[PDB]
Design a protein around this nucleic acid. Sequence first.
RNA 1: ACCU
Lengths: 114, 116
Amino acid sequence: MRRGEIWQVDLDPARGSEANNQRPAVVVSNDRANATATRLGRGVITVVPVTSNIAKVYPFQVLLSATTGLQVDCKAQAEQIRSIATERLLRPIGRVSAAELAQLDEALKLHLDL
Amino acid sequence: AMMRRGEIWQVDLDPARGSEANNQRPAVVVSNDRANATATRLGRGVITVVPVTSNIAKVYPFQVLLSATTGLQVDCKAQAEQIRSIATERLLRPIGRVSAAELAQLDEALKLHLDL
RNA sequence: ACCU
């Protein structure tokens, strides 16, 4: 997996307002860590869960447009950031645009006070 | 009980799969204090933490050595690569607080891990 | 999904 790619991930079981079920997520961990996790068969990668509920788009969230990829308009929730074992990766879906990824970088900086 | 950035809490990470950090262990709050304040006020929602381990054999650039001289009983390292948002109900107990210097390091460790 |  690579940073910017959209993957179907298994987030269950989730507690409280943690994003649940099997849903798309954007890889945001750097590619050196991603490359290290793949071949070794261990380690974690970091992803940003995605939701179809787009009634509100907070500044720490990024609107993703449906393309081949996501079938409906969605928003990436940087506040839902989560490091997961690679075995949670189910399906490759596609990748966000460079514009969407650049926005996600800013959303992550904002959320993590970086 | 307000959780603040830089503070250390006993968090419940179970159940975990694969190489995911597990069990009930210390973690450093790294989400901004606006989100944090909102989370306590509403009694729900997610805040973001960085898990901590006592296995300090090697400290990677995306990891930060935390001195016991923290609330932590022994020397530990914060694993920015294990960062995850958690529901407030996973917050069990406040433990302590990292120094301003250690937190700055953690910010740098977060930037490196997340390519920011 | 829900909450922000």
